[PDB]
């Protein structure tokens, strides 16, 4: 069980990034802050792939993965 945290998100990016992640996997325990998004990842996609796809929109330093 792994957790993803996205920080310093701009207006409209919390929802957008939630949607982007949803095309890649199935998120649980989703927390949508005013400028952040965290969720639990089932572990069915490599984290390097999530990173590459999310970087179409944000920068890699805005993404952190950790063991819950």
């Amino acid at each position: 069980p792994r957790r993803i945290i996205l920080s310093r998100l701009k207006a409209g990016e919390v929802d957008l990034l939630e949607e982007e992640l949803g095309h890649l996997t199935t998120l649980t325990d989703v927390v949508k802050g005013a400028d952040s998004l965290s969720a639990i990842l089932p572990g069915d996609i490599a984290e390097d792939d999530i990173t590459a796809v999310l970087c179409f929109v944000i920068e890699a330093d805005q993404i952190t993965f950790e063991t819950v």
Binding site: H23, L24, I45, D49, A52, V53, F56, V57
Partner: protein, 128 residues
């Protein structure tokens, strides 16, 4: 971005090419050319002067991923922006586009507003 930026719209369906050309016109970009597949697109890209590629995923002879990878592996045009157009938000294609170096992707059919958001993010990332 420079309104004279030269775009190449690649798609094997004429209607879809014309739709993309017209949406770009709506956004103020009128310097646009079209190609019918990866082979035709590469031939045109050699002519030089292109500053942005919007390419469909599924095409005969040479598909979009193959064209993207060929662009990226070339010397002269290796950093050309490339926006992949796909029919569905399929995870393996989105991942494949990203890992192959696409500047972004967009799902068709798309509107002028969606196109604009996608183009701006790319302009932002490449400093255009």
């Amino acid at each position: 971005a420079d309104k004279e930026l030269k775009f190449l719209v690649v798609d094997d369906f004429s209607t879809m090419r014309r739709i993309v050309r017209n949406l770009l016109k709506e956004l103020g970009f009128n310097n646009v050319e079209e190609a019918e597949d990866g082979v035709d697109a590469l031939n045109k890209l050699q002519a030089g002067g292109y500053g942005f590629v919007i390419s469909d995923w599924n095409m005969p002879n040479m598909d979009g991923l193959e064209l993207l990878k060929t662009i990226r592996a070339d010397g002269a045009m290796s950093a050309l922006p490339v926006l992949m157009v796909t029919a569905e938000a399929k995870k393996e294609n989105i991942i494949a586009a990203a890992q192959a170096g696409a500047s972004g992707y967009v799902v068709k059919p798309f509107t002028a507003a969606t196109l604009e958001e996608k183009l701006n993010k790319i302009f932002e990332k490449l400093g255009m």
